PDB file of all heavy atoms in Angstrom:
ATOM      1  N   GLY L  10     -23.529  17.536 -31.884  1.00  0.00           N
ATOM      2  CA  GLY L  10     -22.863  16.333 -32.415  1.00  0.00           C
ATOM      3  C   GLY L  10     -21.537  16.590 -33.161  1.00  0.00           C
ATOM      4  O   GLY L  10     -21.037  15.680 -33.832  1.00  0.00           O
ATOM      5  N   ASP L  11     -20.966  17.804 -33.073  1.00  0.00           N
ATOM      6  CA  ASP L  11     -19.693  18.049 -33.657  1.00  0.00           C
ATOM      7  C   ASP L  11     -18.500  17.359 -32.983  1.00  0.00           C
ATOM      8  O   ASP L  11     -17.398  17.373 -33.498  1.00  0.00           O
ATOM      9  CB  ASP L  11     -19.442  19.539 -33.873  1.00  0.00           C
ATOM     10  CG  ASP L  11     -19.364  20.377 -32.611  1.00  0.00           C
ATOM     11  OD1 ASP L  11     -19.742  19.875 -31.502  1.00  0.00           O
ATOM     12  OD2 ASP L  11     -19.004  21.544 -32.733  1.00  0.00           O
ATOM     13  N   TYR L  12     -18.750  16.795 -31.782  1.00  0.00           N
ATOM     14  CA  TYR L  12     -17.804  15.870 -31.132  1.00  0.00           C
ATOM     15  C   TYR L  12     -18.574  14.582 -30.932  1.00  0.00           C
ATOM     16  O   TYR L  12     -19.740  14.619 -30.603  1.00  0.00           O
ATOM     17  CB  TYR L  12     -17.286  16.425 -29.787  1.00  0.00           C
ATOM     18  CG  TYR L  12     -16.433  17.634 -29.909  1.00  0.00           C
ATOM     19  CD1 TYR L  12     -16.993  18.839 -30.334  1.00  0.00           C
ATOM     20  CD2 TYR L  12     -15.027  17.581 -29.737  1.00  0.00           C
ATOM     21  CE1 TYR L  12     -16.214  19.952 -30.456  1.00  0.00           C
ATOM     22  CE2 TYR L  12     -14.278  18.714 -29.888  1.00  0.00           C
ATOM     23  CZ  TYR L  12     -14.844  19.904 -30.307  1.00  0.00           C
ATOM     24  OH  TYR L  12     -14.104  21.042 -30.446  1.00  0.00           O
ATOM     25  N   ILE L  13     -17.895  13.463 -31.174  1.00  0.00           N
ATOM     26  CA  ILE L  13     -18.616  12.186 -31.161  1.00  0.00           C
ATOM     27  C   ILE L  13     -18.780  11.668 -29.752  1.00  0.00           C
ATOM     28  O   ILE L  13     -17.834  11.616 -29.022  1.00  0.00           O
ATOM     29  CB  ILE L  13     -17.814  11.132 -32.039  1.00  0.00           C
ATOM     30  CG1 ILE L  13     -17.965  11.505 -33.525  1.00  0.00           C
ATOM     31  CG2 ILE L  13     -18.406   9.728 -31.853  1.00  0.00           C
ATOM     32  CD1 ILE L  13     -17.083  10.675 -34.424  1.00  0.00           C
ATOM     33  N   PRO L  14     -20.037  11.251 -29.363  1.00  0.00           N
ATOM     34  CA  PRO L  14     -21.237  11.413 -30.137  1.00  0.00           C
ATOM     35  C   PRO L  14     -21.954  12.736 -29.939  1.00  0.00           C
ATOM     36  O   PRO L  14     -22.746  13.203 -30.770  1.00  0.00           O
ATOM     37  CB  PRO L  14     -22.090  10.222 -29.589  1.00  0.00           C
ATOM     38  CG  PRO L  14     -21.652  10.181 -28.100  1.00  0.00           C
ATOM     39  CD  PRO L  14     -20.181  10.497 -28.162  1.00  0.00           C
ATOM     40  N   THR L  15     -21.732  13.386 -28.793  1.00  0.00           N
ATOM     41  CA  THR L  15     -22.066  14.745 -28.500  1.00  0.00           C
ATOM     42  C   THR L  15     -20.943  15.384 -27.726  1.00  0.00           C
ATOM     43  O   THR L  15     -20.168  14.646 -27.140  1.00  0.00           O
ATOM     44  CB  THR L  15     -23.409  14.947 -27.723  1.00  0.00           C
ATOM     45  OG1 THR L  15     -23.170  14.332 -26.406  1.00  0.00           O
ATOM     46  CG2 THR L  15     -24.540  14.287 -28.375  1.00  0.00           C
ATOM     47  N   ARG L  16     -20.868  16.698 -27.666  1.00  0.00           N
ATOM     48  CA  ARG L  16     -19.920  17.389 -26.807  1.00  0.00           C
ATOM     49  C   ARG L  16     -20.064  16.888 -25.382  1.00  0.00           C
ATOM     50  O   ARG L  16     -19.038  16.547 -24.747  1.00  0.00           O
ATOM     51  CB  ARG L  16     -20.096  18.851 -26.856  1.00  0.00           C
ATOM     52  CG  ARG L  16     -19.738  19.478 -28.127  1.00  0.00           C
ATOM     53  CD  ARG L  16     -19.873  21.036 -28.031  1.00  0.00           C
ATOM     54  NE  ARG L  16     -19.720  21.679 -29.315  1.00  0.00           N
ATOM     55  CZ  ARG L  16     -19.745  22.991 -29.541  1.00  0.00           C
ATOM     56  NH1 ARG L  16     -19.870  23.823 -28.527  1.00  0.00           N
ATOM     57  NH2 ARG L  16     -19.548  23.440 -30.741  1.00  0.00           N
ATOM     58  N   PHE L  17     -21.252  16.793 -24.859  1.00  0.00           N
ATOM     59  CA  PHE L  17     -21.444  16.384 -23.492  1.00  0.00           C
ATOM     60  C   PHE L  17     -20.880  14.971 -23.204  1.00  0.00           C
ATOM     61  O   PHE L  17     -20.204  14.777 -22.271  1.00  0.00           O
ATOM     62  CB  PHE L  17     -22.894  16.417 -23.092  1.00  0.00           C
ATOM     63  CG  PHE L  17     -23.057  16.065 -21.658  1.00  0.00           C
ATOM     64  CD1 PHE L  17     -22.830  16.994 -20.669  1.00  0.00           C
ATOM     65  CD2 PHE L  17     -23.334  14.770 -21.293  1.00  0.00           C
ATOM     66  CE1 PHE L  17     -22.897  16.651 -19.329  1.00  0.00           C
ATOM     67  CE2 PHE L  17     -23.393  14.399 -19.926  1.00  0.00           C
ATOM     68  CZ  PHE L  17     -23.147  15.355 -18.969  1.00  0.00           C
ATOM     69  N   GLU L  18     -21.224  14.046 -24.109  1.00  0.00           N
ATOM     70  CA  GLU L  18     -20.831  12.644 -23.926  1.00  0.00           C
ATOM     71  C   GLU L  18     -19.363  12.466 -24.125  1.00  0.00           C
ATOM     72  O   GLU L  18     -18.712  11.593 -23.568  1.00  0.00           O
ATOM     73  CB  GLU L  18     -21.644  11.753 -24.806  1.00  0.00           C
ATOM     74  CG  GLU L  18     -23.110  11.580 -24.348  1.00  0.00           C
ATOM     75  CD  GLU L  18     -23.144  10.857 -23.004  1.00  0.00           C
ATOM     76  OE1 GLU L  18     -22.381   9.889 -22.848  1.00  0.00           O
ATOM     77  OE2 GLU L  18     -23.958  11.229 -22.156  1.00  0.00           O
ATOM     78  N   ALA L  19     -18.804  13.197 -25.047  1.00  0.00           N
ATOM     79  CA  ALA L  19     -17.353  13.248 -25.313  1.00  0.00           C
ATOM     80  C   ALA L  19     -16.578  13.644 -24.095  1.00  0.00           C
ATOM     81  O   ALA L  19     -15.562  13.095 -23.712  1.00  0.00           O
ATOM     82  CB  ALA L  19     -17.014  14.019 -26.514  1.00  0.00           C
ATOM     83  N   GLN L  20     -17.100  14.650 -23.432  1.00  0.00           N
ATOM     84  CA  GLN L  20     -16.546  15.188 -22.231  1.00  0.00           C
ATOM     85  C   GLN L  20     -16.685  14.089 -21.099  1.00  0.00           C
ATOM     86  O   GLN L  20     -15.723  13.853 -20.360  1.00  0.00           O
ATOM     87  CB  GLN L  20     -17.343  16.469 -21.806  1.00  0.00           C
ATOM     88  CG  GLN L  20     -17.342  16.796 -20.351  1.00  0.00           C
ATOM     89  CD  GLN L  20     -18.264  17.924 -20.107  1.00  0.00           C
ATOM     90  OE1 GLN L  20     -17.810  19.073 -19.882  1.00  0.00           O
ATOM     91  NE2 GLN L  20     -19.550  17.655 -20.178  1.00  0.00           N
ATOM     92  N   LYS L  21     -17.817  13.450 -21.030  1.00  0.00           N
ATOM     93  CA  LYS L  21     -18.072  12.439 -19.984  1.00  0.00           C
ATOM     94  C   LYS L  21     -17.023  11.316 -19.961  1.00  0.00           C
ATOM     95  O   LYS L  21     -16.558  10.906 -18.912  1.00  0.00           O
ATOM     96  CB  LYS L  21     -19.496  11.895 -20.092  1.00  0.00           C
ATOM     97  CG  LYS L  21     -19.926  11.101 -18.884  1.00  0.00           C
ATOM     98  CD  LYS L  21     -21.343  10.570 -19.062  1.00  0.00           C
ATOM     99  CE  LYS L  21     -21.847   9.759 -17.899  1.00  0.00           C
ATOM    100  NZ  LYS L  21     -23.068   9.003 -18.279  1.00  0.00           N
ATOM    101  N   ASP L  22     -16.638  10.850 -21.136  1.00  0.00           N
ATOM    102  CA  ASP L  22     -15.576   9.843 -21.305  1.00  0.00           C
ATOM    103  C   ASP L  22     -14.218  10.391 -20.834  1.00  0.00           C
ATOM    104  O   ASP L  22     -13.420   9.742 -20.247  1.00  0.00           O
ATOM    105  CB  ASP L  22     -15.484   9.274 -22.710  1.00  0.00           C
ATOM    106  CG  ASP L  22     -16.610   8.331 -23.070  1.00  0.00           C
ATOM    107  OD1 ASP L  22     -17.568   8.145 -22.263  1.00  0.00           O
ATOM    108  OD2 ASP L  22     -16.589   7.798 -24.188  1.00  0.00           O
ATOM    109  N   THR L  23     -13.956  11.647 -21.193  1.00  0.00           N
ATOM    110  CA  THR L  23     -12.711  12.309 -20.792  1.00  0.00           C
ATOM    111  C   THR L  23     -12.574  12.476 -19.268  1.00  0.00           C
ATOM    112  O   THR L  23     -11.480  12.388 -18.684  1.00  0.00           O
ATOM    113  CB  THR L  23     -12.602  13.686 -21.492  1.00  0.00           C
ATOM    114  OG1 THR L  23     -12.841  13.463 -22.872  1.00  0.00           O
ATOM    115  CG2 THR L  23     -11.261  14.258 -21.287  1.00  0.00           C
ATOM    116  N   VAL L  24     -13.685  12.744 -18.583  1.00  0.00           N
ATOM    117  CA  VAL L  24     -13.684  12.844 -17.165  1.00  0.00           C
ATOM    118  C   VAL L  24     -13.112  11.571 -16.461  1.00  0.00           C
ATOM    119  O   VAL L  24     -12.332  11.626 -15.550  1.00  0.00           O
ATOM    120  CB  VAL L  24     -15.136  13.130 -16.607  1.00  0.00           C
ATOM    121  CG1 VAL L  24     -15.202  12.989 -15.078  1.00  0.00           C
ATOM    122  CG2 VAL L  24     -15.618  14.514 -17.063  1.00  0.00           C
ATOM    123  N   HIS L  25     -13.501  10.407 -17.024  1.00  0.00           N
ATOM    124  CA  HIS L  25     -13.025   9.180 -16.421  1.00  0.00           C
ATOM    125  C   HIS L  25     -11.502   9.066 -16.549  1.00  0.00           C
ATOM    126  O   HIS L  25     -10.808   8.627 -15.647  1.00  0.00           O
ATOM    127  CB  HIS L  25     -13.746   7.969 -17.091  1.00  0.00           C
ATOM    128  CG  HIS L  25     -13.692   6.711 -16.264  1.00  0.00           C
ATOM    129  ND1 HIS L  25     -14.516   5.597 -16.541  1.00  0.00           N
ATOM    130  CD2 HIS L  25     -13.049   6.373 -15.200  1.00  0.00           C
ATOM    131  CE1 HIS L  25     -14.254   4.614 -15.656  1.00  0.00           C
ATOM    132  NE2 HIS L  25     -13.347   5.079 -14.809  1.00  0.00           N
ATOM    133  N   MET L  26     -10.992   9.494 -17.687  1.00  0.00           N
ATOM    134  CA  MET L  26      -9.556   9.489 -17.905  1.00  0.00           C
ATOM    135  C   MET L  26      -8.804  10.367 -16.939  1.00  0.00           C
ATOM    136  O   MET L  26      -7.782   9.975 -16.345  1.00  0.00           O
ATOM    137  CB  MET L  26      -9.279   9.800 -19.432  1.00  0.00           C
ATOM    138  CG  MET L  26      -7.797   9.904 -19.789  1.00  0.00           C
ATOM    139  SD  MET L  26      -6.935  11.389 -19.357  1.00  0.00           S
ATOM    140  CE  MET L  26      -7.782  12.604 -20.317  1.00  0.00           C
ATOM    141  N   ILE L  27      -9.296  11.608 -16.769  1.00  0.00           N
ATOM    142  CA  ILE L  27      -8.716  12.563 -15.834  1.00  0.00           C
ATOM    143  C   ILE L  27      -8.732  12.008 -14.418  1.00  0.00           C
ATOM    144  O   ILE L  27      -7.776  12.027 -13.677  1.00  0.00           O
ATOM    145  CB  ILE L  27      -9.455  13.923 -15.858  1.00  0.00           C
ATOM    146  CG1 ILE L  27      -9.291  14.557 -17.242  1.00  0.00           C
ATOM    147  CG2 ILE L  27      -8.905  14.860 -14.798  1.00  0.00           C
ATOM    148  CD1 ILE L  27      -7.892  14.903 -17.624  1.00  0.00           C
ATOM    149  N   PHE L  28      -9.888  11.504 -14.010  1.00  0.00           N
ATOM    150  CA  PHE L  28     -10.080  10.811 -12.723  1.00  0.00           C
ATOM    151  C   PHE L  28      -9.059   9.753 -12.455  1.00  0.00           C
ATOM    152  O   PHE L  28      -8.378   9.740 -11.389  1.00  0.00           O
ATOM    153  CB  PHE L  28     -11.502  10.355 -12.552  1.00  0.00           C
ATOM    154  CG  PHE L  28     -11.871   9.755 -11.220  1.00  0.00           C
ATOM    155  CD1 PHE L  28     -12.534  10.563 -10.282  1.00  0.00           C
ATOM    156  CD2 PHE L  28     -11.542   8.464 -10.884  1.00  0.00           C
ATOM    157  CE1 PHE L  28     -12.893  10.054  -9.058  1.00  0.00           C
ATOM    158  CE2 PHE L  28     -11.900   7.947  -9.647  1.00  0.00           C
ATOM    159  CZ  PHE L  28     -12.594   8.727  -8.737  1.00  0.00           C
ATOM    160  N   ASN L  29      -8.882   8.896 -13.409  1.00  0.00           N
ATOM    161  CA  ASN L  29      -7.948   7.804 -13.295  1.00  0.00           C
ATOM    162  C   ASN L  29      -6.503   8.302 -13.236  1.00  0.00           C
ATOM    163  O   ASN L  29      -5.710   7.745 -12.483  1.00  0.00           O
ATOM    164  CB  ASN L  29      -8.112   6.748 -14.390  1.00  0.00           C
ATOM    165  CG  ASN L  29      -9.373   5.879 -14.157  1.00  0.00           C
ATOM    166  OD1 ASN L  29     -10.000   5.957 -13.115  1.00  0.00           O
ATOM    167  ND2 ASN L  29      -9.679   5.082 -15.177  1.00  0.00           N
ATOM    168  N   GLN L  30      -6.174   9.359 -14.003  1.00  0.00           N
ATOM    169  CA  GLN L  30      -4.873   9.975 -13.922  1.00  0.00           C
ATOM    170  C   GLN L  30      -4.578  10.346 -12.447  1.00  0.00           C
ATOM    171  O   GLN L  30      -3.506  10.028 -11.901  1.00  0.00           O
ATOM    172  CB  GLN L  30      -4.732  11.123 -14.846  1.00  0.00           C
ATOM    173  CG  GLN L  30      -3.346  11.798 -14.967  1.00  0.00           C
ATOM    174  CD  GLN L  30      -3.085  12.848 -13.873  1.00  0.00           C
ATOM    175  OE1 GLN L  30      -3.814  13.866 -13.778  1.00  0.00           O
ATOM    176  NE2 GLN L  30      -2.108  12.600 -13.048  1.00  0.00           N
ATOM    177  N   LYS L  31      -5.541  11.065 -11.823  1.00  0.00           N
ATOM    178  CA  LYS L  31      -5.345  11.538 -10.488  1.00  0.00           C
ATOM    179  C   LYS L  31      -5.223  10.351  -9.468  1.00  0.00           C
ATOM    180  O   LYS L  31      -4.379  10.287  -8.607  1.00  0.00           O
ATOM    181  CB  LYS L  31      -6.460  12.477 -10.063  1.00  0.00           C
ATOM    182  CG  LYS L  31      -6.584  13.712 -10.920  1.00  0.00           C
ATOM    183  CD  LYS L  31      -5.307  14.485 -10.988  1.00  0.00           C
ATOM    184  CE  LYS L  31      -5.384  15.673 -11.869  1.00  0.00           C
ATOM    185  NZ  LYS L  31      -4.041  16.200 -12.207  1.00  0.00           N
ATOM    186  N   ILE L  32      -6.130   9.371  -9.575  1.00  0.00           N
ATOM    187  CA  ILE L  32      -6.194   8.270  -8.656  1.00  0.00           C
ATOM    188  C   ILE L  32      -4.923   7.436  -8.756  1.00  0.00           C
ATOM    189  O   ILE L  32      -4.425   6.900  -7.754  1.00  0.00           O
ATOM    190  CB  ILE L  32      -7.503   7.447  -8.868  1.00  0.00           C
ATOM    191  CG1 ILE L  32      -8.528   7.852  -7.916  1.00  0.00           C
ATOM    192  CG2 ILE L  32      -7.224   5.956  -8.717  1.00  0.00           C
ATOM    193  CD1 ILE L  32      -8.851   9.336  -7.984  1.00  0.00           C
ATOM    194  N   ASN L  33      -4.375   7.352  -9.968  1.00  0.00           N
ATOM    195  CA  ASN L  33      -3.188   6.583 -10.173  1.00  0.00           C
ATOM    196  C   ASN L  33      -1.858   7.318  -9.834  1.00  0.00           C
ATOM    197  O   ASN L  33      -0.845   6.648  -9.786  1.00  0.00           O
ATOM    198  CB  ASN L  33      -3.141   6.044 -11.657  1.00  0.00           C
ATOM    199  CG  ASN L  33      -4.229   4.988 -11.928  1.00  0.00           C
ATOM    200  OD1 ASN L  33      -4.715   4.339 -10.986  1.00  0.00           O
ATOM    201  ND2 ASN L  33      -4.622   4.874 -13.169  1.00  0.00           N
ATOM    202  N   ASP L  34      -1.964   8.640  -9.623  1.00  0.00           N
ATOM    203  CA  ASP L  34      -0.754   9.450  -9.338  1.00  0.00           C
ATOM    204  C   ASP L  34      -0.264   9.286  -7.914  1.00  0.00           C
ATOM    205  O   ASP L  34       0.994   9.399  -7.657  1.00  0.00           O
ATOM    206  CB  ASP L  34      -0.994  10.934  -9.702  1.00  0.00           C
ATOM    207  CG  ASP L  34       0.248  11.583 -10.353  1.00  0.00           C
ATOM    208  OD1 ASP L  34       0.801  10.942 -11.298  1.00  0.00           O
ATOM    209  OD2 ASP L  34       0.617  12.686  -9.982  1.00  0.00           O
ATOM    210  N   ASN L  35      -1.196   9.084  -7.005  1.00  0.00           N
ATOM    211  CA  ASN L  35      -0.848   9.055  -5.579  1.00  0.00           C
ATOM    212  C   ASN L  35      -2.030   8.348  -4.908  1.00  0.00           C
ATOM    213  O   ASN L  35      -3.189   8.673  -5.228  1.00  0.00           O
ATOM    214  CB  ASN L  35      -0.648  10.451  -5.049  1.00  0.00           C
ATOM    215  CG  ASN L  35      -0.163  10.455  -3.592  1.00  0.00           C
ATOM    216  OD1 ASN L  35      -0.846   9.972  -2.688  1.00  0.00           O
ATOM    217  ND2 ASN L  35       0.978  11.014  -3.321  1.00  0.00           N
ATOM    218  N   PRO L  36      -1.758   7.390  -4.003  1.00  0.00           N
ATOM    219  CA  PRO L  36      -2.808   6.687  -3.320  1.00  0.00           C
ATOM    220  C   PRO L  36      -3.848   7.442  -2.511  1.00  0.00           C
ATOM    221  O   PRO L  36      -4.886   6.952  -2.125  1.00  0.00           O
ATOM    222  CB  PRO L  36      -2.133   5.513  -2.605  1.00  0.00           C
ATOM    223  CG  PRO L  36      -0.751   6.060  -2.348  1.00  0.00           C
ATOM    224  CD  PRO L  36      -0.451   6.947  -3.539  1.00  0.00           C
ATOM    225  N   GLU L  37      -3.440   8.649  -2.138  1.00  0.00           N
ATOM    226  CA  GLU L  37      -4.291   9.572  -1.377  1.00  0.00           C
ATOM    227  C   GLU L  37      -4.959  10.669  -2.162  1.00  0.00           C
ATOM    228  O   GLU L  37      -5.710  11.487  -1.605  1.00  0.00           O
ATOM    229  CB  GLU L  37      -3.467  10.161  -0.251  1.00  0.00           C
ATOM    230  CG  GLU L  37      -3.102   9.163   0.808  1.00  0.00           C
ATOM    231  CD  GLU L  37      -2.604   9.816   2.056  1.00  0.00           C
ATOM    232  OE1 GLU L  37      -1.481  10.360   1.984  1.00  0.00           O
ATOM    233  OE2 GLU L  37      -3.362   9.846   3.080  1.00  0.00           O
ATOM    234  N   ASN L  38      -4.730  10.687  -3.491  1.00  0.00           N
ATOM    235  CA  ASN L  38      -5.412  11.704  -4.313  1.00  0.00           C
ATOM    236  C   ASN L  38      -6.885  11.502  -4.323  1.00  0.00           C
ATOM    237  O   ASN L  38      -7.369  10.299  -4.353  1.00  0.00           O
ATOM    238  CB  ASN L  38      -4.898  11.741  -5.725  1.00  0.00           C
ATOM    239  CG  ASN L  38      -3.519  12.410  -5.816  1.00  0.00           C
ATOM    240  OD1 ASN L  38      -3.021  12.930  -4.837  1.00  0.00           O
ATOM    241  ND2 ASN L  38      -2.973  12.430  -7.021  1.00  0.00           N
ATOM    242  N   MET L  39      -7.674  12.575  -4.365  1.00  0.00           N
ATOM    243  CA  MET L  39      -9.128  12.544  -4.436  1.00  0.00           C
ATOM    244  C   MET L  39      -9.580  13.445  -5.524  1.00  0.00           C
ATOM    245  O   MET L  39      -8.957  14.437  -5.795  1.00  0.00           O
ATOM    246  CB  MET L  39      -9.717  13.027  -3.112  1.00  0.00           C
ATOM    247  CG  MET L  39      -9.183  12.344  -1.925  1.00  0.00           C
ATOM    248  SD  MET L  39     -10.169  10.892  -1.598  1.00  0.00           S
ATOM    249  CE  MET L  39     -11.343  11.535  -0.480  1.00  0.00           C
ATOM    250  N   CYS L  40     -10.748  13.167  -6.099  1.00  0.00           N
ATOM    251  CA  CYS L  40     -11.428  13.955  -7.092  1.00  0.00           C
ATOM    252  C   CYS L  40     -12.883  14.232  -6.727  1.00  0.00           C
ATOM    253  O   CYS L  40     -13.561  13.327  -6.227  1.00  0.00           O
ATOM    254  CB  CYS L  40     -11.337  13.481  -8.504  1.00  0.00           C
ATOM    255  SG  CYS L  40      -9.754  13.140  -9.141  1.00  0.00           S
ATOM    256  N   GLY L  41     -13.371  15.437  -6.985  1.00  0.00           N
ATOM    257  CA  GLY L  41     -14.785  15.758  -6.854  1.00  0.00           C
ATOM    258  C   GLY L  41     -15.297  16.194  -8.212  1.00  0.00           C
ATOM    259  O   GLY L  41     -14.538  16.405  -9.163  1.00  0.00           O
ATOM    260  N   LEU L  42     -16.623  16.308  -8.278  1.00  0.00           N
ATOM    261  CA  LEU L  42     -17.320  16.542  -9.546  1.00  0.00           C
ATOM    262  C   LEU L  42     -18.317  17.738  -9.359  1.00  0.00           C
ATOM    263  O   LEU L  42     -19.099  17.701  -8.428  1.00  0.00           O
ATOM    264  CB  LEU L  42     -18.065  15.303 -10.020  1.00  0.00           C
ATOM    265  CG  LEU L  42     -18.788  15.410 -11.333  1.00  0.00           C
ATOM    266  CD1 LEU L  42     -17.785  15.659 -12.460  1.00  0.00           C
ATOM    267  CD2 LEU L  42     -19.633  14.174 -11.630  1.00  0.00           C
ATOM    268  N   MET L  43     -18.254  18.636 -10.299  1.00  0.00           N
ATOM    269  CA  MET L  43     -19.175  19.763 -10.337  1.00  0.00           C
ATOM    270  C   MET L  43     -19.668  19.970 -11.735  1.00  0.00           C
ATOM    271  O   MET L  43     -18.938  19.613 -12.705  1.00  0.00           O
ATOM    272  CB  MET L  43     -18.482  21.129  -9.938  1.00  0.00           C
ATOM    273  CG  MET L  43     -18.313  21.300  -8.539  1.00  0.00           C
ATOM    274  SD  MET L  43     -17.507  22.912  -8.241  1.00  0.00           S
ATOM    275  CE  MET L  43     -18.645  24.019  -9.030  1.00  0.00           C
ATOM    276  N   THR L  44     -20.817  20.550 -11.870  1.00  0.00           N
ATOM    277  CA  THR L  44     -21.249  21.124 -13.144  1.00  0.00           C
ATOM    278  C   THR L  44     -21.041  22.632 -13.182  1.00  0.00           C
ATOM    279  O   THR L  44     -20.925  23.299 -12.149  1.00  0.00           O
ATOM    280  CB  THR L  44     -22.766  20.926 -13.326  1.00  0.00           C
ATOM    281  OG1 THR L  44     -23.461  21.673 -12.317  1.00  0.00           O
ATOM    282  CG2 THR L  44     -23.160  19.499 -13.288  1.00  0.00           C
TER     283      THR L  44
END
């Protein structure tokens, strides 16, 4: 919980931002997800 609300959940919200950055940069950009 040293990142709000947990490190994992903090990261999860950041993923959406990165995703949207890529999708908004070029109509043909794609993203995949790994652990």
